[PDB]
Every structure is written in structure tokens, then in C-alpha cells.
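Example with several molecule types.
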Amino acid sequence: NPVIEITLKTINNLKVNSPPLFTEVIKAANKYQQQAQALSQAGLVLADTLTRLTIHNGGDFGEGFKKLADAIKDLENRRDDVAKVLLNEFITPNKQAIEDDQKAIATFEKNYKKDRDQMRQDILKLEAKTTTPEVLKQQITELNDKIKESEQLNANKLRDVVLMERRKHATFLSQFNQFLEKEIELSADTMSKFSTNLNTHRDLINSQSQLPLEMESMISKQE
Amino acid sequence: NPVIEITLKTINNLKVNSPPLFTEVIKAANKYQQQAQALSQAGLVLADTLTRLTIHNGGDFGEGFKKLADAIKDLENRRDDVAKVLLNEFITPNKQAIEDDQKAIATFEKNYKKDRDQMRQDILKLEAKTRKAGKITELNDKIKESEQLNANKLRDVVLMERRKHATFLSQFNQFLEKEIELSADTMSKFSTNLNTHRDLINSQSQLPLEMESMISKQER
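Resulting C-alpha cells for the full complex:
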């Protein structure tokens, strides 16, 4: 029976195959998050070294260095927040969900054995409840009714478990989406910020051959 | 002489202050680049665990998992490219720049002194001269020649500092441009993933036709 076969196969997948595989994704995501924080902190140190350029270097270039430092700092702070989202919105909630689901499939399987065994019973007894054609008949149309009733249980239980699997997967994606949205946000902030620095640097680079006019104004004044 | 003092202050800054400050930037950047590679490698692992969900899970969700893993894989490989650009285009070239700039200000100072002194030896011998020759506008003029040797050397050294800072920014820009490129691809790819996920999530309570048809086939 195909209906029963897929039900059993879907049950095996959720109880046996799924929990370790999804748990590997969690471990992998947990490590990724840790490395993201590491990159974030390495970014802040870099930002600080750029700020320290402004100790002895003022003027417009000094302004550029400070502006570059502030941009990198702000972006690296936001990368940290991205890592936190992956941890708080995916890793921890899905870890809990993996275990909750693992218990839910145990229960469904129990009730599956029970309902199918209960159905086995009062079909045997309705079988073993068995001469005028108006007696054998209502014994026949009754046995068949219980079989059409058992068949409807198998199909209901197939729906129930297939939908249990789709709801598990949808929750997985729905939680992972929180990290994706924040990644998109960070990327958008990066494009917005780094373009302003590029524009500033380009004007700075194109002006490397001209003295600042407060430099000049000092030369004219000397007399 | 504010013209002269700024000149000495710029020689000192380029000679003494700047090289350790810029070297520290190179160091912090090398560390940043390495953490970026580590993050990239951890990402590849993550994309692998996602792909492995396809073994037992297929249909629409399985294909969703695959496209998610593929998206993360491409992006984390691009993050590695970005880290390379920072190393090959900024870290390595500016390391050489700092060394070269040290030789430059060294050579400059050698000639800043050599020329400034020889000027004094000439200016004294000339005021020493017309003293015993009136017993002289060339004096006035030669004095204005010094004020030109000074002002030129000031321009020269401030421009040396400007070129140094320009080169620094120009090399760093290569990395910024690649960060921007990575950000654009991230927005594009993840936006596609979100759209795929919305469809899947919205259809979690819908039994596939292949299931509905299998059920009906059992009744016959």
C-alpha cells in the first residue's frame, strides 16, 4: 500500500533522518556567527588605527581618514548585530524547534500504531461475527464500511504527517529569513556609506598636487 | 619664520610619526583580511550542511534548500575575493609605499640641509663683501632668493605628504569598491531567496497534487 508506505517513510524521515541533519546546520551556523563577530572586532581595531592617523595629520586628508574610520566602525558594529540576529532569531529558536518536533513525531507515531491496531481489532471481530441473504448482507455491507473507514484513516494520517514536514521546513526558512533580511540591510548600508567615502577620496586624490590655500596665504603674508 | 617651521614639522612628521602609524594600519588590515577568510570558510561549511538537507528532503522545499546553499556558496567565495583584493591591492603595495617614502624623506632631508647651509655660506660672504666695498641690492636680492629656496622646499615637502596620503587612499579604494560589489550581489541573490521562501512558507498547509492523486488512486 502506497499511502501507508509514504506515511511510514515521512515518519522515518522526521524521527531518524531529519534531527541530525538540521542540527548540523545549527552547529555550522553557530560557528559562522562566531567568525562574524571576530571579523567585526578586527574591523574595529582597523577603524581605530585609521583614527590614530588624525593625531598628526590634519587638513582635508585628516578629515578623510576620520570619515573612513567612522564608516568602518559603524558598519562593523552593524555586522555584529547581524551575527546576533542569526544567533537569537535562528540558532537558538530552531535548536528548540528540532527537539520539540522530535517529540511531536514520537507522539504521532504512537497514535499511528494505536489507531491502525484498533482498526485491525473491530475488523477481525466484525469478521469473526460471521444465514438468510438478509443477514449475510448486512454483515457484508458492514465489514466493507469499516474497511472504507480504515482506508480514510490511512489517508488522513498521510496528510497529517506530510503537513507536519512542510510546517517544519517552513519554520526553518522563516527563521533563517531574519538573518537574510539583516544581511540585505547591512549590504545596503555598506553601499550607501562606502560610496560617500569613495567620492570624498576621489576629490582628495585629484587634489594631491595643489597646496591648501591656507598654506599659500601664509606664503604671501611672509614679508 | 612660520614658513620654515611648518617645513621642519612636515619633515619630522613624514620621517618620525607617519611610518609607525601607517604600519599599524597595515597590520590591523592584515588581521581583518584573515578573519574575512575564516568567515568565508565557515560560510562554505554552512552552505554544505544546507545542501545535505537535499539527500532526504526534495520536492519544492528541497530545491529551496539547494538554491539557498548555492547562494551562500557563491557569496562566501566572493568574500574571499574581497579579502584578496585588500591584501594584493592595499596591504602589500602600501607596505612597499611606506618603505619608499622613508627613503624619499631621507634623501630630501639630506638636501634640505646641504642646500640651506650652502645658502648661508653664500649670504654671509656677500654681506661680508660689500661691507668692505662701500668703504648690496644683490644682498637684498640674494636674501629674497633664500625666501624662495625656503618656500619651494615647503611646497615640495607638503606635496610629498599629500602624494603619500593620496596613494594610501587610492590603494584602499580598491577594497572599498569590491566591498560595494559584494554588497550588490548579496542584495540581489538573497532577495531572490526570500521570494522563494515566501512562496514555500505560504504553501506549508497545502498538500501537493502528487499526494492528493496518490490517495485517490488507492480508492480504486
